[PDB]
Amino acid sequence: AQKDEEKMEIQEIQLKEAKHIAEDADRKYEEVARKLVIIESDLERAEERAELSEGKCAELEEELKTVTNNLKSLEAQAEKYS
Amino acid sequence: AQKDEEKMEIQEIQLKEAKHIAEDADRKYEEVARKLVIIESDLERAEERAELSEGKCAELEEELKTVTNNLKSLEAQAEKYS
Amino acid sequence: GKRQTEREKKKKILAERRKVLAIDHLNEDQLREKAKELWQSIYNLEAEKFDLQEKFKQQKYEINVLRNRINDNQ
Amino acid sequence: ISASRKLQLKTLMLQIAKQELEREAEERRGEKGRALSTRCQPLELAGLSFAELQDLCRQLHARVDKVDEERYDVEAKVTKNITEIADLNQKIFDLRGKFKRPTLRRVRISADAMMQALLGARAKETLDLRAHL
Amino acid sequence: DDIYKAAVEQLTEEQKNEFKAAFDIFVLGAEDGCISTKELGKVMRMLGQNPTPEELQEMIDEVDEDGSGTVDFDEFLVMMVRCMKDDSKGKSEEELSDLFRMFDKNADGYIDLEELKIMLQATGETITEDDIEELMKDGDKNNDGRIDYDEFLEFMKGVE
Amino acid sequence: DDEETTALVCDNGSGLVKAGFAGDDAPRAVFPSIVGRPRHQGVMVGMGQKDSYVGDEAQSKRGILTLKYPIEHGIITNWDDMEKIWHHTFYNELRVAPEEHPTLLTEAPLNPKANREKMTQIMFETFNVPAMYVAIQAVLSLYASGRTTGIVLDSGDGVTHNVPIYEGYALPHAIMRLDLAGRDLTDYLMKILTERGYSFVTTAEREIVRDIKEKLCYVALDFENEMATAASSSSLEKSYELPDGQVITIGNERFRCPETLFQPSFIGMESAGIHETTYNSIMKCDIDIRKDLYANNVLSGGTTMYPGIADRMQKEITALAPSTMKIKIIAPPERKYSVWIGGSILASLSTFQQMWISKQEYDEAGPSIVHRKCF
Amino acid sequence: DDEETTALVCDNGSGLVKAGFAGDDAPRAVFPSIVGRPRHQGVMVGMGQKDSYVGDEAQSKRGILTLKYPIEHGIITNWDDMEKIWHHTFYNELRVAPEEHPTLLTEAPLNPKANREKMTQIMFETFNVPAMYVAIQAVLSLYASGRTTGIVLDSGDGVTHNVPIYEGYALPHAIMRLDLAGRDLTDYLMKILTERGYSFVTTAEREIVRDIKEKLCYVALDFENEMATAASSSSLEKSYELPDGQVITIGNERFRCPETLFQPSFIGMESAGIHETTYNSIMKCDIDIRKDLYANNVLSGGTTMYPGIADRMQKEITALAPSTMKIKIIAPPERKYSVWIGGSILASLSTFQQMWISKQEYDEAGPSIVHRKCF
Numbered sequence A, B: 001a002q003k004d005e006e007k008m009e010i011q012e013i014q015l016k017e018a019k020h021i022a023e024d025a026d027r028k029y030e031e032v033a034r035k036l037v038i039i040e041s042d043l044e045r046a047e048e049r050a051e052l053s054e055g056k057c058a059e060l061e062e063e064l065k066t067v068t069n070n071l072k073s074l075e076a077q078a079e080k081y082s
Numbered sequence C: 001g002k003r004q005t006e007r008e009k010k011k012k013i014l015a016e017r018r019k020v021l022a023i024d025h026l027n028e029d030q031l032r033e034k035a036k037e038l039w040q041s042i043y044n045l046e047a048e049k050f051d052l053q054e055k056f057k058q059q060k061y062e063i064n065v066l067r068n069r070i071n072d073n074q
Numbered sequence D: 001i002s003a004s005r006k007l008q009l010k011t012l013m014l015q016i017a018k019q020e021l022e023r024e025a026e027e028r029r030g031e032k033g034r035a036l037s038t039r040c041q042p043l044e045l046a047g048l049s050f051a052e053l054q055d056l057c058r059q060l061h062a063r064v065d066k067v068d069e070e071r072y073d074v075e076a077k078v079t080k081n082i083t084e085i086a087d088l089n090q091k092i093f094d095l096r097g098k099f100k101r102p103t104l105r106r107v108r109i110s111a112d113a114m115m116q117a118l119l120g121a122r123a124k125e126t127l128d129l130r131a132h133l
Numbered sequence E: 001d002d003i004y005k006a007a008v009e010q011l012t013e014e015q016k017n018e019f020k021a022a023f024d025i026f027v028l029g030a031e032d033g034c035i036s037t038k039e040l041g042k043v044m045r046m047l048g049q050n051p052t053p054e055e056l057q058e059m060i061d062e063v064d065e066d067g068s069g070t071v072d073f074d075e076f077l078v079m080m081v082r083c084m085k086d087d088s089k090g091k092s093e094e095e096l097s098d099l100f101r102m103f104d105k106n107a108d109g110y111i112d113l114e115e116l117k118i119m120l121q122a123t124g125e126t127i128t129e130d131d132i133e134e135l136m137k138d139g140d141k142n143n144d145g146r147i148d149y150d151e152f153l154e155f156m157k158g159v160e
Numbered sequence F, G: 001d002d003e004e005t006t007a008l009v010c011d012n013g014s015g016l017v018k019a020g021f022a023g024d025d026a027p028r029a030v031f032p033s034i035v036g037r038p039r040h041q042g043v044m045v046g047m048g049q050k051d052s053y054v055g056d057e058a059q060s061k062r063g064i065l066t067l068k069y070p071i072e073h074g075i076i077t078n079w080d081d082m083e084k085i086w087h088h089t090f091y092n093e094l095r096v097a098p099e100e101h102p103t104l105l106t107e108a109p110l111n112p113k114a115n116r117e118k119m120t121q122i123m124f125e126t127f128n129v130p131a132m133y134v135a136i137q138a139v140l141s142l143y144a145s146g147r148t149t150g151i152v153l154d155s156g157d158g159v160t161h162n163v164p165i166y167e168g169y170a171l172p173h174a175i176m177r178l179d180l181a182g183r184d185l186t187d188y189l190m191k192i193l194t195e196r197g198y199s200f201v202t203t204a205e206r207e208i209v210r211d212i213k214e215k216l217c218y219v220a221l222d223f224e225n226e227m228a229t230a231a232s233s234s235s236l237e238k239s240y241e242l243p244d245g246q247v248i249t250i251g252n253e254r255f256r257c258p259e260t261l262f263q264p265s266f267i268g269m270e271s272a273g274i275h276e277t278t279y280n281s282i283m284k285c286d287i288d289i290r291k292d293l294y295a296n297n298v299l300s301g302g303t304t305m306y307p308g309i310a311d312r313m314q315k316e317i318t319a320l321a322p323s324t325m326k327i328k329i330i331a332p333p334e335r336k337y338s339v340w341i342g343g344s345i346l347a348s349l350s351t352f353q354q355m356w357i358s359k360q361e362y363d364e365a366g367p368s369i370v371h372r373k374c375f
Ligand SMILES: Nc1ncnc2c1ncn2[C@@H]1O[C@H](COP(=O)(O)OP(=O)(O)O)[C@@H](O)[C@H]1O
Pocket: F012, F013, F014, F015, F016, F017, F155, F156, F157, F158, F182, F183, F186, F210, F213, F214, F215, F301, F302, F303, F305, F306, F336
């Protein structure tokens, strides 16, 4: 019985240490979750703004093409009327 | 002595549960570490490419302005020709 | 096209469904009471119109705020 | 930076805002009264016989019809723009706060200190074993 | 300044239970009631309250500059009650919006710095290092050159 | 700006509503005129789901809506939806209450009277404008060109009409209105795309086919040569990416869709193309103003924006017309908004300021005032 | 808390019953849904032996019981046992009488009507709740992610279903329900373990095989390479200690058990894997909302917790989908309780407070009220 009491108290201090380790891990978990949420929100915004920029670039490119071609044709016609 | 032994068994199961907590915490934390790093790298790249597109779009704006002016000139020439 | 409901509502409230009143066919006390009731109705209608004007100002403020937020974020 | 300016600052800002709000409310009420007097003048209470009161009531009823059509117009307008205000407030919530609406929550308040079921199970097993003898 | 400290001077048993819990965790009796700010933050993380490290790091950067680690009771309890969320709904959103649009005279969809400074000076409060450039530093998140209602909330969220 | 009062130059159109204050260069808000009720059930609660998305909002949620245009061919077939579109245009795209602004609507030639009368009745009773005026969509397009003569072919999206004008005197007996327009070209393109395997059926996918038509189709200078070339080489096949991937390749469907304009027999219509109804409209005019109309042929409207139409039409008319006359086709780069620019110019004139239909006049004669002197 | 009234967010599930009051983060009591009568004779007198141990009590005395789940595939096959489970859940795991609390059950899509009607009849007659509402298990999992669009694959333990949603408008014609789930994976693992010598037959040992599956199995990124590697090296063989000793070593059974999800031909099922029924569910949707569904693919349910599934599924869909679209797979760490968290959020909403099926309404229309407007 004496030996068993010894083992009981040893396991008792071990259990307290275990609980503390558990709480520390819990706090770390909450922290990392917060960080991940923030960074992912930033990812959303970054992707969306990238898309906006790409679309606008496309539209401006097309308009440039059209106007340039019209100008070239009218230049040819100016020579013709000369 | 029997009561003490029962106490010991209880402590044993609790220690088991604590180690279980430790392992699951570590696993989830490593997972979130992976996700964090991947998200961060991709966010960096996305911001870079979006800014590149923005610069190209501004250049396109200037090009379009040049073309518009030249078309105005050619149109005036053609109408006077008429 | 089916706009008869809206026009019907507005016109009927204007002419038929309004508080149609005959006022010059009452006794002295009755005519006085009717005139006072109509005066109260007029003043309360003008108060309601002013309150709607204040709400219109608030709506203008809200519309400007929403437009500014959209322009900032889009 | 001092952590002392925040509470006094917010209290003083709240008081100044409340004073401004009540000033604006009283200004609105007074201007409403003045405008209402302008739109419809007050009546008189001396020397009126039946006929002049009848004529005044006819003029008042013509004004009643006028203010009735004015009020019907402004009331339809206010109904439509109050519906618009509700619709656009819901639109703004769906645009910006659509994700914050389910975010405001009350969680992580139970499982943090809920490890005492094992004690109950151990007590039950010990009770059964003791009841055996 | 006065809220948390005054509440400490009229401390309630509701918070005094946790105060004595942290006391027996920290102070063994017949001591100086030290509760070092590093240990204070560590145990605030430990003791089942909200373990937000921002307040802990602020406390570290604010106190225990004497070189001994001793923390006085008044500021310790002030920071203990400040680690929790202590506000009453930040008033009403519609109320504050009306108050700010009364503060807002330009009416261009936002509000400029001049009106905000006028309202702050009309409040009539003392000036410390948290003025002048702290407002500019906090409000300039996207640096739009202006401070709107959203930015006004961003500066001092939870306006009681 | 400030005191004073500016006019609202609205332009209902059919396919794109263009509006803006008088005196500017371009319309302030341009958005499709579609009103689409949701068609599925909807399970999320409190999402703030409305009962009808109008304008440009329904071009983003079109995946779960059933878009339906309220204007079929110039005429208006669904008055409640049109009222909704006008209400949106006034309050959300311009944010100006109509109680303090004159309006200048536009209407195609030869339209039913009841449409115009109902339009003015709505504008005066529901929105309660101070004064409104209705103008023919071709005279404005002639204003915008800065001319005073010329025969204008305004090929919109609903209806194509061809109004000849000389020295400011319109010729009412020479207006040739044809109901082939951009919408029929969209339907025909959607019908010939099925020859390669791509099937678009839903009313939402009509918008995708419209985008294909706008971005890829062009008018061939000579039809048979293009048909022969596209059948031998592969230099014409241009690809396009759908809203979800799966790129498609358009072959000789590119110049066959807009060819319907010059051969309306493709969609089964009997009448002659836009190249021959202009010549017929000219020949109905007097013998002494035909040279001026030949020299000042004006193009307008959206559908005349196809790349290469100003040359095909000139070639066709030169083939039809006598060899001595000079054929010139005015195709300004701002073709799409030509009608609205002309509307702004007309509303900004001082001489025009007394032609509005004032509200007291409507109160005295009823909605039939529009057919009277105030046209 | 105090005055007022909180709602009970129960979630029957199939394999684990999850319950708790509305407005929290995690379910209060989670316990297996098994009811096991004793099967041996019993000689000790006065031991206080009950006739049926339910819930988590029968996972400790499982050595002398015959556990039998009352829910086979979403549907409920044994109503008395299910009533017993509900009674236990209300009275012993939450200790709140149901007479004073609304309930929010959850149900898989495409389930038999009679199951739902019997569920509501039980809740209103036996337990006598004030008001109950039945919700589809996928919409809640979409609530919990804080999205409003996306296609959610909720691979539970009974049945795997794949509900696509856009802008809050569910698409009823694109729900693909497949009956392969965690239970079939447990049976297949128990069947392939026999290739090494370990035979598990008793219904109690199915729990041991389930524990093996949970703790050891993982989804391979590439199946053939893993099959080749496990057949040459021995770096995969992980050992596990049975409830009595005699450790066992699992070789290439580790990634072959959960591979059945992507190749249902292993257990003889004809249909395609969970990697291809998602793509088919997307392709049934309209052409304009496919990009959003591609970008917001959501995973939920217990069985989607295998280590390495969020990469295998993304690789497979990227192989199937067009190369331009971006494929993103949302796999929150709180996957198992995602449905219940969403249920709590939905029950906590103010807009939802008038959708409950009030008892007087049931008294007037009978149990068939659930199919009516109050869905
Ligand atoms: N750039 C373009 N190329 C080819 N077709 C176009 C182009 N832009 C518009 N369209 C066609 O013209 C129509 C718009 O015509 P529009 O002039 O807006 O009609 P409305 O007279 O009703 O305003 C669209 O339906 C489209 O089919």
